[PDB]
């Protein structure tokens, strides 16, 4: 009388709630709310850090992303990731417009479909504002919204299915990704690098010669963003057990400690490299690097190793940021360095420190990693993170370039010398007051 | 040995907690905390949107409202709405100063009195800062606080009882109001219109001729407010089941989707009406309109209809805002257009799309609306929303006018030409710095 | 097969989760997240209130404190407070680096070790940013971080053990401290007074003669801080039951009401003392005073007495702030007046109003206070708050002075007249822009 398909049964004849522990559902409902406030967190963070005045306010853009992503998820995003009749590479349109999404056990069986929909939808939205922030410089809004809908559909949704889906080939292969380091962070990072390399401003003056590595538009914005992100990450990582067990709280302790050691580590590196300065921007980026690092690992690794997930990503991401000098590109490179590089490092290290007895805390069964002499685990992590990077860079490139050849879908004006025109363009962007301007400052052309 | 009255029994002889599912209580406790942060959310929103410099900071005023409303609720607000011995129009003073408020099942039987008190108290506080924001222009603080205490007592509390109370006549009549669209939004909106029409500044220059429809004091404030409100609304709507079932999470999905489609819809309307501009203020107002729209409906309607609750309120509220031109009044009209008009539209539409099988998800029994060929439901919604609008406008008018004839209770100086006096009044309000001024800039008169 | 020691048992043979109610764990997990956002709350509050421009941004410093405190807690802070093999004055290094912290019932038996670790760790972090804010004026960052690690280890951890530990002598003596008014507020306040008296700037011009009592750096910052603190305090106080019972929600109602009456009370006192001005800073400080006041009491006293916990601390703390005039010291005195004095008053009053039938709501057994003719309870409170004040002032003094005699550990330059040097020092601090400066403005000396 509980069917385990469609709606899960007839509400007029059964209590669909009897299939689930109530406390499990409450923790996952709460966690969903927490992940949501991470979305403006991303916006405040990349708005503040910018070494350039972005015409588009990313704090505002975070609300736009929340709107676009929620409609995409409802329309067919959810179905494409978490339908029960999927192949090994993709879901279906079976839950188009959330049809029959109710009380059947979700692919995470301790919660029903409708709760898993709510939870996982927040993950797609966080990824959308990361993507929007990566390609925001001189972006046209219309094209940006279209781009996000397309990118969530053909880049986020396939990768998410491989990672989390019923018959996802990475699931079947035995690759570990606790809280979606692959679909969210690694994914958005390498999509950001496609933006940088194809549409980013080349020979950029903020990224060339002896200019300061850190030159923030707004420190108070960076801090507010980091606050929202660290606060929300308890639901992001802690809710990825799908339950109310103590593995949830174990994963929260790991999240806190990786952030803390990441923050301190990056600020220490900067101290050595500057000859004794204390970096305010760097402490914040280090916390984000630890959070990203521990994401694929938080419910799999022992508590004292969570420190390594703060330390090692902070060091490597800190140096990765220097590649902006080498390439002389600024646009999009911060998101690649933190989420792309940090996601890769964290996914790799999970292969080293995953432990079957950490997973077993709530009955979850894994072979483990190098901790349990499971050497081959490292190979499973690499196949995951290489597949994710390859698909993300390639398909994001194809979308950017294809939209670039269509005049009314082009995301960024090509900027391909009238004295009067240059004076006007400068003043157009310089005089704008985002605080009081009721309208988006749309990129301006020769007409 | 569980009495079901007063305190519910003797703590020294029974565990009063045995009467309730623990997960139910945890979700409602959590939801209470969430609703609380909506209070500064309202303050930041209406502070930012203002086309005029308000002498009173509404962000600060939100904390004042939290103080006044919590004391009023404790004193007799709770008793007047949720006492167990009420008539059909009002409660009693039986729980004066929260006497014997403990472990008896509340009128929402899945939680005890003391938890329902906490939860529903947040609803009264949200309504108080909406009211304070509606009548803040040139308000005197002393009179404003008194006004709020009186207005919560004789306007909020009767309407809330009709909607939610043990023998409330709207409850008995079969009108649907899931999360209090009536007591909170519709109520505060039509009380706002009474302020506009009786005390609002007439022939206002920001609302007359060809002046810009949107001219915000602070965009970053609007965005921060919208963030807090959308975040908190998960508890506002999701906790209105009184339990931990999947109807709670179903209602959260509806809340997210209505906000998203409301945001996109209002920004699209503005795009047509401006000939291609992207409205930053409008995206935010559209999200608020959807949230308001879905409030009476969130746990009653099917997921794909939640889109309509974003779209239709966004369009109608957008045009309602133009009535400010027609009347040449600005003061108080934003709250009427969003909460008054949006609450009305959402209450009406609930009569159309309510479905007994959506309610049945957690065992709740309703005849449903037009979805279940229950045509008469639309008539029940209209009687609710007309009663609410009539009582709110009339009794708020009477309070405003009565306080206006008492010199030391008058809320706003009548402003009924010395050259020197006008220069001084202008400079008084212009020179004030809210960031650093330790005191409220009290309205200034000829002495 | 549940051992009740070390890890609590073998995860491969038992479900350690069977020992606990799931709803209990979910509420305490949620509460932990809430307490965390109180940390930037403290930072925003004391940044905004300052009558001086602090070279160190306290909003930023709150994230630093979160990093340092999380690492200290992991390293040995947790072990020193909540190890199961402690003496009567201190814990052990048994859980060094969180070794074997998992599934054994914690000293609060309704939650496991790993969840109690997470929860109580937030309390240590809140105390760390209070301490950092108290001694931030002209602080050198390196020394400040070292200082925090040392102070949490030898001041916070002993006092916390006495209050909360397995064999803590204050626990055994029967002193009541519901949510840690002793370890957090009283403690940090009297440590702040040691800073003021030993390192604070003497004959300070902002604290001398006829200068304004309130002269805030940023009102919007005070308000944002108060918002985060009041929001988080629901977890701070509500989670101190260790469970999901209605005593948790009872304690939340008490928290809300004490804040509200504290806010209104302080603003009323200021109104009398200024001859009719409305104090924006004072409403906020009054809310904080009530929150502090009700902290040792929230789950022990009857609801209508929670009003007294707002009123009496607001009055006394308001006058305590005047002692800054008497001493002509500003540095560190705000934290003493609010948390030191307010913690003392609230601890004292708990001895008066504690009621065994309030505790009994969830089965907790106490003799009660003067409500249950238990006169001796007042003596137990005094011994607690005198021990806490004595240990905090003395050992903080010794740490400050000892670091002051070591050139590279000195927290504040001694400031012990070149015309050119004075012009330069003035311009150094005046010209700094915290919004855009990528580095901490380190105190500057003659080289
Ligand atoms: C499910 C989510 C989907 C939401 C809706 C998506 C709609 C997007 C389609 C593109 O729309 C165009 O985008 C603007 C570019 O941003 C256009 O140009 C506007 O902006 C300038 C571009 O900078 C132009 O030069 C024009 O002056 C001005 O009309 C604007 O007219 C509009 O036609
Ligand atoms: C349970 C919640 C209730 C909380 C307490 C409510 C108390 C309110 C009563 C009214 O109080 C008056 O309000 C001020 C007006 O705002 C008065 O004028 C003050 O403000 C100016 C008005 O603009 C005046 O001209 C005077 O100079 C100045 O004394 C002030 O003196 C005070 O008498
Ligand atoms: C577990 C948490 C622990 C985290 C790490 C703690 C490390 C703290 C040790 C002290 O470090 C010193 O602190 C700076 C003082 O703040 C020093 O001077 C720096 O700052 C100026 C002091 O104002 C000096 O004059 C110098 O120019 C400049 O090098 C800096 O070099 C560094 O040696
Ligand atoms: C780079 C760091 C990778 C850590 O890899 C180590 O390799 C295993 C082998 O060198 C260690 O011993 C592991 O070897 C297993 C096989 O005997 C045992 O069961 C032990 O429990 C287990 O510590 C294991 O701890 C782990 O730290
Ligand atoms: C304005 C939009 C209002 C929608 O009202 C419709 O009216 C009912 C009649 O026209 C529809 O059929 C309803 O009629 C019931 C009576 O047979 C059936 O049981 C069906 O389930 C049910 O779809 C119902 O869906 C509903 O959409
Ligand atoms: C300063 C304010 C301290 C309040 O102390 C009072 O003292 C008790 C004695 O004066 C009161 O009666 C208490 O005395 C007990 C002994 O008979 C009874 O049981 C009553 O329940 C109890 O109200 C008690 O309420 C309490 O308010």
Author numbering:
A (entry chain A), B (entry chain A), C (entry chain A): 4 to 419, 424 to 454
Sentences from the paper on this structure:
The channels of phosphorylation-mimicking mutants of C. well-defined electronegative pocket that is solvent accessible. in turn might cause substantial conformational changes within the CTR. residues has only undergone a slight shift compared with the WT protein. WT CaMep2, the DD mutant and phosphorylated protein (S453J). from Asp452 and Asp453, presumably to avoid electrostatic repulsion. generates conformational changes in the conserved part of the CTR. Leu427 to Asp438 unravels during the simulations to a disordered state. remainder of the protein is not affected.
structures of the Mep2 transceptors from S. cerevisiae and C. albicans. function as ammonium receptors/sensors in fungal development. a central channel for the transport of ammonium. non-phosphorylated, with channels that are closed on the cytoplasmic side.
